[PDB]
């Protein structure tokens, strides 16, 4: 069963501060069994988990009813958190593995 | 005799309108002596407005007021007077007439004139949700819009391409306009606002705006600029 | 025909200068639709600036351009018109004008106006030195005034007691006005020229202009304020 | 002979950067047997000379025909010109002796 890793779209974003950055992971999915990951890169360059679907409080991901994308964003965001981020698809059918996206970068701007 | 110069019409008007100032002359034969009328506005100095001859065959103004402002004088009545027409913000301050040789030797007491708006801030202001952004072709990118009050959904969404005039992508924050693709869609109403783009395309290139049409003024939002990344 | 919007009259001009805008239409009843100018300043964005019913009977225009700019229109020639006074350099950016329903149908292409920085003056500018000052009674006092261009010894100072209007004090720079005291002194000619009070005293507190008669605008200095201390 | 200290008019001077500011020391002395300084308050408290009659280029005194006044003033007066000064009359006379006049503040606003 060869399956695509998910697509992680914008591939930049340049928010302003107190606003609501708001990423969308897409993935086409081979089967149902499947739960979706939100990593955001640490300084040391590996992957720390913000939040997961199905399940922080500043970031929250939701399922666009289109069975393709999700919407995974950060609420009032601040200004450190500009990074590096990216989703990652966990399959539990036959086989538990885990694809990672393409990493993209979050700028916030100073109000 | 006492010489003598007396102010009358300053008020509150809106900017646009008008207003007329009178000066009443005693002490000196009104026929044979320039008049002028001088102002200035709150905290400031002195500025010339304009200026009649003593038989009023010659006027004088300077270009802010030019075609503005129309001074004029009733020797029988011994009366000058300051036609005011598209008042700005600029014109508020104290207005004087004067006698004017070679100096202005005698002063009225002035008029208060005001030009002022009472709009304040009222008016609604709108923000755009990335400020810009970058996608591939087919990715699907979603943007909101944010209205200071409630509009209902009097929102609308522009298309402006580099070197291009805005084209009208989404009215009333559903519709969409003639010969828009069907890609495009608009949702919202009350305050929050989004426009969702299904599978960029390479003809997406452009900066989005988002407007209201509830009341004026009609404000426009920052837009947000879709790069099309390497 | 078919729909169309061309604007012609944009050009550059200094601040305070006059430009007028021309929208000409076809391809729809004119006379029926409301009409708009929406500019854009060149690197910020859109914001609406007029607009004018289809009949021509009513005018909305934004607080910034009230009193200066004036929509109209011309529905025998199907054309529009913009009559942009007195220039600023918030000014500066592609004008468009729109039909106007609950949304803006249909762009012009769009016209470009840029206000330089260019020119300053054209007016003998007049400039006061001390610009503020307190002095002990029997203390001399002086007050400068430099003149742009040359004026001779064409000069004027004013006094303004608070509350009051502007008196007389000193003409063609040296001759005192009557009922002036002798401690006033005036001197100079071409472009520097001085008021000396050579003993203060508390009823000389007041505030102090300059002003040129040479040429026209009559032009003020900025006001030299003289505080007393004791 | 007790001699009076000179006088340091104006005692605040409000002046535009890029213009002239001018003061006046008055000085009705007994003798024509002295000189005049100009000092300026260092931070440090120490009257800096700037000038001197007779005699930096910004700082020029000149002699008014009265006998009695001097205008010293700062051409083209930077922002940070802005501090306390004061005249100075130093006496070649019998005896020598300075006598200090009464410190003056001086602000220099922006454009
Ligand atoms: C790809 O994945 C999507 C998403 O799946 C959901 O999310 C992930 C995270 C996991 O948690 C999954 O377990 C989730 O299901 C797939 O999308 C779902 O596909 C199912 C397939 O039907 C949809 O099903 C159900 O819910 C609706 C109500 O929302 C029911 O009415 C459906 O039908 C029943 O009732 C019928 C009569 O009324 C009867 O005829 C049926 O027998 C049945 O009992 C059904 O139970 C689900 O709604 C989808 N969710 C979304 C968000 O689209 C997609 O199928 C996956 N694709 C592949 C190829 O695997
Ligand atoms: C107080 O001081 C003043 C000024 O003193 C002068 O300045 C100080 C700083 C020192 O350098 C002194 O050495 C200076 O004198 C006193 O005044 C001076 O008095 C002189 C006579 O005693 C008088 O005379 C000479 O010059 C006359 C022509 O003057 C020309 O120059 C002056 C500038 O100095 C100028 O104003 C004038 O217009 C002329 O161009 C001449 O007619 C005389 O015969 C004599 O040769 C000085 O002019 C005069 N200086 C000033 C500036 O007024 C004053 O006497 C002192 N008072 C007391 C009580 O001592
Ligand atoms: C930023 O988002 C928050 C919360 O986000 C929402 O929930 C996510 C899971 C996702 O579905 C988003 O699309 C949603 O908008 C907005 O929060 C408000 O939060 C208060 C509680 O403090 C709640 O009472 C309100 O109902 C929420 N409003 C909405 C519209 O959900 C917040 O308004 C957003 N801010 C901006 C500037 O968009
Ligand atoms: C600022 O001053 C200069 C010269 O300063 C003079 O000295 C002072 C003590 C003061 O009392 C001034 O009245 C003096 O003029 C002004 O410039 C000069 O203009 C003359 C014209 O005849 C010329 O010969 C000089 O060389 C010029 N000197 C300089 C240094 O420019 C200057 O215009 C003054 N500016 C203002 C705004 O007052
Ligand atoms: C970001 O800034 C907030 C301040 O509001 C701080 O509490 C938080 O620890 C910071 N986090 C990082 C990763 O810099
Ligand atoms: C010294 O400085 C103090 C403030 O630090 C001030 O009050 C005092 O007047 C100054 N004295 C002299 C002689 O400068
Ligand atoms: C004042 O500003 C000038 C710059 O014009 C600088 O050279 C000088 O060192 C400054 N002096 C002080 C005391 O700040």
């Known amino acids: 069963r060869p399956w695509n890793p998910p697509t992680f779209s914008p591939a930049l974003l340049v928010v302003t501060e107190g606003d609501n950055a708001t990423f969308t992971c897409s993935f086409s999915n081979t089967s149902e069994s499947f739960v979706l990951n939100w990593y955001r890169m640490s300084p040391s360059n590996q992957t720390d988990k913000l939040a997961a679907f199905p399940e922080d409080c500043r970031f929250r991901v939701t399922q666009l009813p289109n069975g393709r994308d999700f919407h995974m964003s950060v609420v009032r965001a601040r200004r450190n958190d500009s990074g590096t981020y990216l989703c990652g698809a966990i399959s539990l059918a036959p086989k538990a593995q885990i694809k990672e996206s393409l990493r993209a970068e979050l700028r916030v701007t100073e109000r | 005799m006492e010489v003598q110069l007396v102010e009358s019409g300053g008020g509150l008007v809106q900017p646009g309108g008008s207003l007329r100032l009178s000066c009443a002359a005693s002490?000196?034969?009104?026929?044979?002596?320039?008049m002028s009328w001088v102002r200035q506005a709150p905290g400031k100095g002195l500025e010339w407005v304009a200026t009649?001859?003593?038989?009023?065959?010659?006027?004088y103004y300077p270009d802010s007021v030019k075609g503005r402002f129309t001074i004029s004088r009733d020797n029988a009545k011994n009366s000058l007077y300051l036609q005011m027409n598209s008042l700005r913000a600029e014109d508020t301050a104290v207005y004087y007439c004067a006698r004017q040789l070679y100096y202005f030797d005698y002063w009225g007491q002035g008029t208060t004139v005001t030009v002022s708006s009472g709009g304040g801030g009222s008016d609604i202001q709108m923000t755009q949700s990335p400020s810009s952004l970058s996608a591939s072709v087919g990715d699907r990118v979603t943007i909101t819009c944010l209205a200071s009050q409630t509009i209902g959904t009097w929102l609308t969404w522009y298309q402006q391409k580099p070197g291009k005039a805005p084209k009208l992508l989404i009215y009333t924050a559903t519709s969409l306009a003639d010969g828009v693709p069907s890609r495009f869609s608009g949702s919202g109403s009350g305050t929050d606002f989004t426009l969702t783009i299904s599978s960029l395309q390479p003809e997406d290139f452009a900066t989005?705006?988002?407007?209201?049409?509830?009341?004026?003024?009609?404000?426009?939002?920052?837009g947000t600029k879709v790069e099309i990344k390497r | 025909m078919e729909v169309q919007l061309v604007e012609s009259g944009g050009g550059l001009v200094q601040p305070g200068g006059s430009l007028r805008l021309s929208c000409?239409?076809?391809?729809?009843?004119?006379?029926?639709?409301?009409?708009?100018?929406v500019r854009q300043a060149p690197g910020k964005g859109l914001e609406w600036?007029?607009?004018?019913?289809?009949?021509?009977?009513?005018?909305?225009?934004?607080d910034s351009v009230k009193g200066r700019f004036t929509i109209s229109r011309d529905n025998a020639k199907n054309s529009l018109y913009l009559q942009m006074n007195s220039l600023r350099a918030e000014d500066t950016a592609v004008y468009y004008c729109a039909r106007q329903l609950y949304y803006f149908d249909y762009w012009g292409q769009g016209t470009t106006v840029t206000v330089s920085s260019g020119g300053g003056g054209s007016d003998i500018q007049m400039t006061q030195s001390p610009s503020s000052l307190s002095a002990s009674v029997g203390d001399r006092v002086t007050i400068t005034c430099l003149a742009s261009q040359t004026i001779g010894t064409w000069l004027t100072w004013y006094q303004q007691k608070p509350g009051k209007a502007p008196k007389l004090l000193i003409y063609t720079a040296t001759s005192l006005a009557d009922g002036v005291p002798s401690r006033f002194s005036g001197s100079g000619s071409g472009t520097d020229f001085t008021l000396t009070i050579s003993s203060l005293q508390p009823e000389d507190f007041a505030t102090y202009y300059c002003?040129?008669?040479?040429?026209?605008?009559?032009?003020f200095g900025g006001g030299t304020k003289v505080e007393i201390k004791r | 002979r007790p001699w009076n200290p000179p006088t340091f008019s104006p005692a605040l001077l409000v002046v535009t950067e890029g213009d002239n500011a001018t003061f006046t020391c008055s000085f009705s002395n007994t003798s024509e047997s002295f000189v005049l300084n100009w000092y300026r308050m260092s931070p440090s408290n120490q009257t800096d000379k700037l000038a001197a009659f007779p005699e930096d280029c910004r700082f020029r005194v000149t002699q008014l025909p009265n006998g009695r006044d001097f205008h010293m003033s700062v051409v083209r007066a930077r922002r940070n010109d802005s501090g306390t000064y004061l005249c100075g009359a130093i006496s070649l006379a019998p005896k020598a002796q300075i006598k200090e006049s009464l410190r003056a503040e001086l602000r220099v606003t922006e454009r």
């Open positions: 002490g000196f034969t009104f026929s044979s002596y320039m």
């Open positions: 002003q040129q008669v040479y040429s026209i605008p009559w032009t």
């Open positions: 009649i001859s003593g038989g009023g065959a010659n006027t």
